[PDB]
Design an enzyme around this catalytic site. Structure first.
Site, PDB file in Angstrom:
ATOM      1  N   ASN A  91       0.823  -1.210   0.000  1.00  0.00           N
ATOM      2  CA  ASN A  91       0.000   0.000   0.000  1.00  0.00           C
ATOM      3  C   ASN A  91       0.862   1.267   0.000  1.00  0.00           C
ATOM      4  O   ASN A  91       0.497   2.268  -0.613  1.00  0.00           O
ATOM      5  CB  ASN A  91      -0.924   0.019   1.220  1.00  0.00           C
ATOM      6  CG  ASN A  91      -2.086  -0.937   1.084  1.00  0.00           C
ATOM      7  OD1 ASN A  91      -2.580  -1.478   2.076  1.00  0.00           O
ATOM      8  ND2 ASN A  91      -2.536  -1.151  -0.142  1.00  0.00           N
TER       9      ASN A  91
ATOM     10  N   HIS B  72      -1.581  -6.815   6.340  1.00  0.00           N
ATOM     11  CA  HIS B  72      -2.891  -6.893   6.961  1.00  0.00           C
ATOM     12  C   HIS B  72      -2.800  -7.449   8.383  1.00  0.00           C
ATOM     13  O   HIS B  72      -3.536  -8.365   8.765  1.00  0.00           O
ATOM     14  CB  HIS B  72      -3.819  -7.728   6.089  1.00  0.00           C
ATOM     15  CG  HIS B  72      -4.371  -6.966   4.926  1.00  0.00           C
ATOM     16  ND1 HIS B  72      -5.342  -7.473   4.095  1.00  0.00           N
ATOM     17  CD2 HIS B  72      -4.105  -5.715   4.480  1.00  0.00           C
ATOM     18  CE1 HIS B  72      -5.651  -6.569   3.180  1.00  0.00           C
ATOM     19  NE2 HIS B  72      -4.913  -5.494   3.395  1.00  0.00           N
TER      20      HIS B  72
ATOM     21  N   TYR C 293       0.540  -8.784  -1.764  1.00  0.00           N
ATOM     22  CA  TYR C 293       0.935  -7.427  -1.411  1.00  0.00           C
ATOM     23  C   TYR C 293       2.425  -7.258  -1.714  1.00  0.00           C
ATOM     24  O   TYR C 293       2.874  -6.179  -2.111  1.00  0.00           O
ATOM     25  CB  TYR C 293       0.603  -7.120   0.061  1.00  0.00           C
ATOM     26  CG  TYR C 293      -0.856  -6.724   0.233  1.00  0.00           C
ATOM     27  CD1 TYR C 293      -1.297  -5.440  -0.095  1.00  0.00           C
ATOM     28  CD2 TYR C 293      -1.815  -7.673   0.593  1.00  0.00           C
ATOM     29  CE1 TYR C 293      -2.654  -5.123  -0.083  1.00  0.00           C
ATOM     30  CE2 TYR C 293      -3.166  -7.364   0.608  1.00  0.00           C
ATOM     31  CZ  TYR C 293      -3.577  -6.094   0.264  1.00  0.00           C
ATOM     32  OH  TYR C 293      -4.920  -5.816   0.237  1.00  0.00           O
TER      33      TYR C 293
ATOM     34  N   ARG D 245      -5.980 -13.828  -0.451  1.00  0.00           N
ATOM     35  CA  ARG D 245      -7.262 -13.887  -1.152  1.00  0.00           C
ATOM     36  C   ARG D 245      -7.174 -13.796  -2.674  1.00  0.00           C
ATOM     37  O   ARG D 245      -8.163 -14.022  -3.368  1.00  0.00           O
ATOM     38  CB  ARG D 245      -8.212 -12.813  -0.595  1.00  0.00           C
ATOM     39  CG  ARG D 245      -7.938 -11.383  -1.037  1.00  0.00           C
ATOM     40  CD  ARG D 245      -8.720 -10.390  -0.175  1.00  0.00           C
ATOM     41  NE  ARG D 245      -8.896  -9.120  -0.870  1.00  0.00           N
ATOM     42  CZ  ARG D 245      -8.098  -8.069  -0.716  1.00  0.00           C
ATOM     43  NH1 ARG D 245      -7.066  -8.126   0.114  1.00  0.00           N
ATOM     44  NH2 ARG D 245      -8.308  -6.974  -1.428  1.00  0.00           N
TER      45      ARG D 245
HETATM   46  C1  LIG Z   1      -2.559  -7.088  -3.059  1.00  0.00           C
HETATM   47  C2  LIG Z   1      -4.048  -6.921  -3.290  1.00  0.00           C
HETATM   48  O1  LIG Z   1      -4.858  -7.889  -3.269  1.00  0.00           O
HETATM   49  N1  LIG Z   1      -4.414  -5.566  -3.573  1.00  0.00           N
HETATM   50  C3  LIG Z   1      -5.870  -5.271  -3.889  1.00  0.00           C
HETATM   51  C4  LIG Z   1      -5.986  -4.926  -5.378  1.00  0.00           C
HETATM   52  O2  LIG Z   1      -5.423  -6.020  -6.142  1.00  0.00           O
HETATM   53  C5  LIG Z   1      -4.279  -5.816  -6.946  1.00  0.00           C
HETATM   54  O3  LIG Z   1      -4.693  -4.814  -7.997  1.00  0.00           O
HETATM   55  C6  LIG Z   1      -3.639  -4.453  -9.010  1.00  0.00           C
HETATM   56  C7  LIG Z   1      -3.744  -3.080  -9.623  1.00  0.00           C
HETATM   57  O4  LIG Z   1      -4.955  -2.812  -9.961  1.00  0.00           O
HETATM   58  O5  LIG Z   1      -2.636  -2.511  -9.958  1.00  0.00           O
HETATM   59  C8  LIG Z   1      -2.584  -5.277  -9.176  1.00  0.00           C
HETATM   60  C9  LIG Z   1      -2.594  -6.664  -8.500  1.00  0.00           C
HETATM   61  O6  LIG Z   1      -2.181  -7.814  -9.215  1.00  0.00           O
HETATM   62  C10 LIG Z   1      -3.853  -7.065  -7.654  1.00  0.00           C
HETATM   63  O7  LIG Z   1      -3.524  -8.137  -6.713  1.00  0.00           O
HETATM   64  C11 LIG Z   1      -7.470  -4.685  -5.762  1.00  0.00           C
HETATM   65  O8  LIG Z   1      -7.619  -4.363  -7.165  1.00  0.00           O
HETATM   66  C12 LIG Z   1      -8.021  -3.543  -4.927  1.00  0.00           C
HETATM   67  C13 LIG Z   1      -9.491  -3.294  -5.265  1.00  0.00           C
HETATM   68  O9  LIG Z   1     -10.356  -4.432  -5.001  1.00  0.00           O
HETATM   69  O10 LIG Z   1      -7.853  -3.855  -3.461  1.00  0.00           O
HETATM   70  C14 LIG Z   1      -6.430  -4.102  -3.068  1.00  0.00           C
HETATM   71  O11 LIG Z   1      -6.317  -4.386  -1.678  1.00  0.00           O
HETATM   72  C1  LIG Z   2     -12.042  -3.029   9.871  1.00  0.00           C
HETATM   73  C2  LIG Z   2     -11.291  -1.685   9.815  1.00  0.00           C
HETATM   74  O1  LIG Z   2     -10.790  -1.204  10.856  1.00  0.00           O
HETATM   75  N1  LIG Z   2     -11.190  -1.001   8.502  1.00  0.00           N
HETATM   76  C3  LIG Z   2     -11.766  -1.542   7.170  1.00  0.00           C
HETATM   77  C4  LIG Z   2     -10.797  -1.333   5.939  1.00  0.00           C
HETATM   78  O2  LIG Z   2      -9.567  -2.029   6.230  1.00  0.00           O
HETATM   79  C5  LIG Z   2      -8.198  -1.507   6.184  1.00  0.00           C
HETATM   80  O3  LIG Z   2      -7.887  -1.964   4.785  1.00  0.00           O
HETATM   81  C6  LIG Z   2      -6.445  -2.291   4.483  1.00  0.00           C
HETATM   82  C7  LIG Z   2      -6.247  -2.592   2.964  1.00  0.00           C
HETATM   83  O4  LIG Z   2      -7.347  -2.536   2.419  1.00  0.00           O
HETATM   84  O5  LIG Z   2      -5.022  -2.951   2.532  1.00  0.00           O
HETATM   85  C8  LIG Z   2      -5.434  -2.330   5.349  1.00  0.00           C
HETATM   86  C9  LIG Z   2      -5.832  -1.996   6.760  1.00  0.00           C
HETATM   87  O6  LIG Z   2      -5.020  -2.666   7.743  1.00  0.00           O
HETATM   88  C10 LIG Z   2      -7.318  -2.216   7.264  1.00  0.00           C
HETATM   89  O7  LIG Z   2      -7.586  -1.811   8.664  1.00  0.00           O
HETATM   90  C11 LIG Z   2     -11.431  -1.935   4.643  1.00  0.00           C
HETATM   91  O8  LIG Z   2     -10.548  -1.771   3.479  1.00  0.00           O
HETATM   92  C12 LIG Z   2     -12.747  -1.223   4.372  1.00  0.00           C
HETATM   93  C13 LIG Z   2     -13.424  -1.822   3.123  1.00  0.00           C
HETATM   94  O9  LIG Z   2     -13.611  -3.293   3.239  1.00  0.00           O
HETATM   95  O10 LIG Z   2     -13.658  -1.376   5.583  1.00  0.00           O
HETATM   96  C14 LIG Z   2     -13.075  -0.836   6.883  1.00  0.00           C
HETATM   97  O11 LIG Z   2     -13.968  -1.014   8.034  1.00  0.00           O
END
Ligand SMILES: CC(=O)N[C@@H]1[C@@H](O[C@@H]2OC(C(=O)O)=C[C@H](O)[C@H]2O)[C@H](O)[C@@H](CO)O[C@H]1O
Ligand SMILES: CC(=O)N[C@@H]1[C@@H](O[C@@H]2OC(C(=O)O)=C[C@H](O)[C@H]2O)[C@H](O)[C@@H](CO)O[C@H]1O
Ligand SMILES: C[As](C)(=O)[O-]
Ligand SMILES: C[As](C)(=O)[O-]
Ligand code: NA
Ligand code: NA
Length: 719
Positions: free
Chosen positions: A179, A229, A238, A292
Site C-alpha cells: 500500500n 494486513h 501485497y 485472497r
Molecule cells: C494485493 C491486493 O490484493 N491488492 C488489492 C488490489 O489487487 C491488486 O490490484 C492491481 C492493480 O490494480 O494494480 C494489481 C494486482 O495484481 C492485484 O492483486 C485490488 O484491485 C483492490 C481493489 O479491489 O484492493 C487491493 O487491496
Molecule cells: C475493519 C477496519 O478497521 N477497517 C476496514 C478497511 O480495512 C483496512 O484496509 C487495508 C487494505 O485494504 O489494505 C489495510 C488496513 O489494515 C485495514 O484496517 C477496509 O478496506 C474497508 C473496506 O472493506 O472497511 C473498513 O472497516
C-alpha cells in the site's frame, strides 16, 4: 517544459513504453492489438449521452467504487494508444476529445473534492488516482497545467498525507509495504504533474520506510517472511504489488532531487533472494503466499509470478555488475523452466516485453536449473521446499497464534477456511495443477493434508489466529527440515498434533492425539489432486491396480497407494507406515469463480479430482504416511521396503521419522521428558528437531516454535 515533464516522460516510458514499440516485433504487436481492441470497445460503448447517468453501462452504479477505477482505467488505455504512432488512434481527434470530456464529466458528477468515499477506499485513494495520474502523464501534451492540477486536486483531498491512508475517514491507517508503494505511484506522480516539490520529497521520504526489515508487524522479515494486513502471510500478493510498483517508480524517483540512498535500497536484493525466489517453482508463485488473490481467475499462480518476475527484472536492469547478471540469471532460469505459461501474457508494457526478449536471447546471461533449497519462513508460518535433482516443490501452509489462517475480505476467498490447517502443496510435472480453475472447483472441505470434521461452513466467516503458538519448522540444511502444528480446528471441537518430516526426496506426514468432541465426522485429506484428461493416472493400492469411481471406495489394510502417470515426474506415491484404512474417489467437480469471489464470473468451471482420505472415528487416533513423488513404480516399491522401519514413534508426546539412507532424524517433542532415539542419542526439550549423523558426530538443528528460539546443544541433545 521542465524537469517534471522530463520525469513524466520517463514514467510514460515505463508504464506504456510507446517509444519502444516496433510493429515488426510479434510480442509487442500482440499487446498493441489488445489495447487497440480495448479502446475500440470503450469508444463504441461509451455513451454519446446528452449528459447521461454514466459513461459506461457496465460500470454505471457509481455506488460500487470499483466502477470509478474501471472507468478511469479505460481512459488510461485511450491515452496509451493516442500517443502510440502505430495505433489506429494515434493523435485521433475523437479519442483526444473523448478522454478530455470524460475527465471533465467524471470530475463533474462522480469523482471530485466535495465527494466522500462510497464503497472501497482503495478505489478512491489508489485505483482511481493512479489511472488519472497515468492518463494525464501520457496525454500531458493535450492538457493544460491548470487542467492537470484541476483534475488532480481530488487526489490531494483524498490522499493529502503520504504516510496514512483512509485519511478522510474516521479510522485511517499507517501506509506500509504494498500500500505504501502505491502511495508513491499516487503522490510522486501527482506531485510531478502538479510540479509540487514538497509533495515529491515528502512522499519519497515516506516510501523509504519500505526498505526497513522488521521483527514484528507488517513488512519483510530477516527470515524472508512478509506479513501484511496485521498478521497475514502475504509475500505473493501485497509483496507482488510492492516489488512491481517500486521497480516502476525507482528510475523516476532516482532522477528527482530526492534520490534514495544506495544502501537503503540494498534490502531489495534480500527480498528477492530470501522472500520471493523460494516461492517460485517452475514459474509458479506458491498460492499459500497469495492470500485472497487465489480466488481471482485472472491471477492464477503462473500469472501472479510474472508480477514478481517483471519487477525483479527491472531491478536487475538498473543494477550493475554481478548483481545485474545474477538477477538476470534468476529471471531467465525461472521463465525458461515454465513450459506451461507464456511469460509475455503478463508483460503489459513495451519496455517490459523488450527487456524480457533481450534477456532470453542473450547467450551471455546464464540460465542454469536452480539448485535445491528449503526456506523455513517461521515469521509467517510457511515452509517452501524444492528438490532440483528429482524436480518437485513442496509447500507447507500453516498458521498460529501469530498469524491469521486465511483472508476473506471484500467478498474474496469465501471458502479458503482450511487453506492453512496444515495444507500442503506438491509442485510436480503438471505445472497447471493449481491453475485452469483449481480454486473454484476444489472441494473446500477437503483441502490436502488437513484434518477437519465435516461440519458445514459459512461463506461469511472470516479468518482467525490459532490458540497455540507451537507451530514451526526446524531446518537442518537445504534438503531436510521438520515441522509441527499444535492444531485445534475453528470451533475447538477437534485437535491433532500434526507434524511433517521433510527428508530430501520425500515428506512424512504424522498426526497423533486426534480427538473429536463434536457429533460430526473427522477425517484427514491425504490428497485431493486435480487431474489432466490428457495424462490419466493408473491407480494402485498395495501394488494392485484399482479402478476409482465417483463413489467412495474403502481400502482397509492399505500399506501403499501409487498414482502412475506416463511422465514419472508426475508420479505420486503414499507409503503408510502402518496398514491404514483409507477411502478414495475420482469425481468431476464443478463450480464457478463467483462462488469463491463475488466479483468473479459465475460461468461454470469443472475439473476431475482424485481424493484420498482417512477417517478418524476414535479419540487418540492417528495417521502416518510418506509422500514420495517423481519415482517410477518399481522404484517406489523398492523405497517403501527401505522405509519399512522409518517410523520411530507417533504418539501424543513424540513423533519421529528416521531416514536410514541419509542418516537423518526428524523429531517433534511436545513435552520435556527424556526421549531416547534409535538407541543412539537423547533429545530433552519440547520442540522441533532435525538431526544428522556423520560418523560419530551429530549435526543438530533445534527450534522451539513458541519462544521462536533455538538452544545450546547440551540443553536439547545428549550422547
Ligand atoms: C494485493 C491486493 O490484493 N491488492 C488489492 C488490489 O489487487 C491488486 O490490484 C492491481 C492493480 O490494480 O494494480 C494489481 C494486482 O495484481 C492485484 O492483486 C485490488 O484491485 C483492490 C481493489 O479491489 O484492493 C487491493 O487491496
Ligand atoms: C475493519 C477496519 O478497521 N477497517 C476496514 C478497511 O480495512 C483496512 O484496509 C487495508 C487494505 O485494504 O489494505 C489495510 C488496513 O489494515 C485495514 O484496517 C477496509 O478496506 C474497508 C473496506 O472493506 O472497511 C473498513 O472497516
Ligand atoms: C462477506 As461475503 C459477502 O463475502 O460473504
Ligand atoms: C451464505 As453463507 C455465509 O451461509 O454461506
Ligand atoms: Na451459512
Ligand atoms: Na457470504
Amino acid at each position: 517544459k521542465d524537469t517534471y515533464t522530463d520525469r513524466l516522460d520517463d514514467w510514460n516510458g515505463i508504464i506504456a513504453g510507446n517509444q519502444y514499440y516496433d510493429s515488426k516485433n510479434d510480442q509487442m504487436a500482440k499487446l498493441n492489438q489488445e489495447l487497440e481492441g480495448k479502446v475500440a470497445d470503450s469508444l463504441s460503448s461509451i455513451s454519446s449521452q446528452a449528459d447521461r447517468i454514466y459513461l459506461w453501462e457496465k460500470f454505471s452504479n457509481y455506488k460500487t467504487s470499483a466502477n470509478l477505477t474501471a472507468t478511469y482505467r479505460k481512459l488510461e488505455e485511450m491515452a496509451k494508444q493516442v500517443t502510440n504512432p502505430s495505433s489506429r488512434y494515434y493523435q485521433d481527434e475523437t479519442v483526444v476529445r473523448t478522454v478530455r470530456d470524460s475527465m471533465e464529466w467524471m470530475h463533474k458528477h462522480v469523482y471530485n473534492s466535495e465527494k466522500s468515499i462510497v464503497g472501497n477506499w482503495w478505489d478512491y485513494e489508489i485505483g482511481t488516482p493512479r489511472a488519472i495520474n497515468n492518463t494525464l502523464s501520457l496525454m500531458k501534451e493535450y492538457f493544460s497545467d491548470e487542467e492537470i492540477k484541476k483534475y488532480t486536486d481530488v487526489i490531494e483531498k483524498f490522499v493529502p498525507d503520504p504516510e496514512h491512508f483512509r485519511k478522510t475517514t474516521d479510522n485511517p491507517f499507517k501506509a506500509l509495504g504494498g500500500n505504501l508503494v502505491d502511495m508513491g505511484r499516487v503522490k510522486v506522480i501527482a506531485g510531478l504533474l502538479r510540479k509540487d516539490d514538497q509533495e515529491i520529497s515528502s512522499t519519497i521520504r515516506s516510501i523509504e520506510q519500505v526498505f526497513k526489515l522488521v521483527d514484528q508487524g507488517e513488512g519483510f522479515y530477516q527470515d524472508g517472511s512478509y506479513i501484511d494486513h496485521t498478521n497475514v502471510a502475504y509475500t505473493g500478493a501485497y509483496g507482488n504489488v510492492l516489488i512491481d510498483g517500486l521497480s516502476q517508480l525507482l528510475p523516476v524517483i532516482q532522477k528527482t532531487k530526492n534520490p534514495i540512498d544506495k544502501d537503503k535500497m540494498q534490502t531489495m536484493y534480500h527480498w528477492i533472494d530470501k522472500s520471493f525466489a523460494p516461492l517460485l517453482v517452475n514459474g509458479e508463485l506458491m498460492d499459500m503466499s497469495r492470500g485472497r488473490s487465489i480466488s481471482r481467475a485472472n491471477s492464477e499462480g503462473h500469472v501472479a509470478a510474472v508480477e514478481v518476475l517483471r519487477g525483479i527484472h527491472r531491478i536487475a536492469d538498473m543494477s550493475e555488475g554481478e548483481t545485474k547478471q545474477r538477477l538476470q540469471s534468476l529471471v531467465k532460469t525461472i521463465v525458461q523452466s515454465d513450459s506451461y505459461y507464456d511469460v509475455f501474457k503478463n508483460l503489459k508494457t513495451y519496455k517490459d516485453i523488450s527487456l524480457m526478449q533481450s534477456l532470453l536471447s542473450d547467450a551471455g546471461v546464464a540460465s542454469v536449473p536452480r539448485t535445491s533449497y528449503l526456506s523455513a519462513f517461521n515469521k509467517m508460518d510457511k515452509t517452501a521446499m524444492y528438490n532440483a535433482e528429482k524436480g518437485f516443490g513442496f509447500g507447507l501452509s500453516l498458521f498460529s497464534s501469530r498469524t491469521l489462517n486465511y483472508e476473506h475480505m471484500n467478498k474474496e476467498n469465501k471458502r479458503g477456511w482450511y487453506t492453512s490447517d496444515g495444507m500442503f502443496y506438491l509442485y510436480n510435472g503438471d505445472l497447471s495443477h493449481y491453475s485452469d480453475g483449481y480454486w473454484p472447483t476444489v472441494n473446500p472441505y477437503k483441502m490436502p493434508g488437513t484434518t477437519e470434521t465435516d461440519a458445514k461452513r459459512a461463506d461469511s466467516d472470516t479468518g482467525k489466529v490459532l490458540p497455540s503458538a507451537f507451530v514451526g519448522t526446524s531446518k537442518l540444511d537445504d534438503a531436510n527440515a521438520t515441522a509441527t502444528m499444535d492444531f485445534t480446528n475453528w470451533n475447538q471441537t477437534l485437535t491433532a498434533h500434526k507434524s511433517w518430516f521433510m527428508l530430501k526426496d520425500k515428506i512424512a506426514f504424522l498426526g497423533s492425539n486426534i480427538q473429536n468432541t463434536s457429533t460430526d465426522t473427522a477425517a484427514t485429506t491425504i490428497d485431493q489432486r486435480k487431474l489432466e484428461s490428457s495424462n490419466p493416472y493408473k491407480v494402485y493400492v498395495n501394488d494392485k491396480e484399482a479402478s476409482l469411481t465417483e463413489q467412495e471406495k474403502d481400502y482397509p489394510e492399505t500399506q501403499s497407494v501409487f498414482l502412475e502417470s506416463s511422465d514419472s515426474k508426475k508420479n505420486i506415491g503414499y507409503f503408510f507406515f502402518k496398514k491404514s484404512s483409507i477411502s478414495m474417489s475420482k469425481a468431476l467437480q464443478k463450480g464457478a469463480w463467483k462462488d469463491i469471489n463475488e466479483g468473479q464470473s459465475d460461468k461454470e468451471v469443472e475439473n476431475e479430482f482424485l481424493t484420498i482420505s482417512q477417517a478418524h472415528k476414535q479419540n487418540g487416533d492417528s495417521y502416518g504416511y510418506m509422500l514420495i513423488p517423481n519415482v517410477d513404480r518399481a522404484t517406489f516399491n523398492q523405497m517403501i521396503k527401505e522405509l519399512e522401519s522409518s517410523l520411530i514413534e507417533n504418539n501424543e508426546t513424540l513423533q519421529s521419522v528416521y531416514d536410514a539412507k541419509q542418516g537423518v532424524w526428524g523429531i517433534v517433542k511436545y513435552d520435556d521428558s527424556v526421549s531416547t532415539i534409535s538407541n543412539q542419542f537423547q533429545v530433552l526439550k519440547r520442540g522441533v528437531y532435525t538431526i544428522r549423523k556423520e560418523g560419530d558426530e551429530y549435526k543438530i538443528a533445534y527450534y522451539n516454535p513458541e519462544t521462536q528460539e533455538s538452544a545450546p546443544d547440551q540443553e536439547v541433545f545428549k550422547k
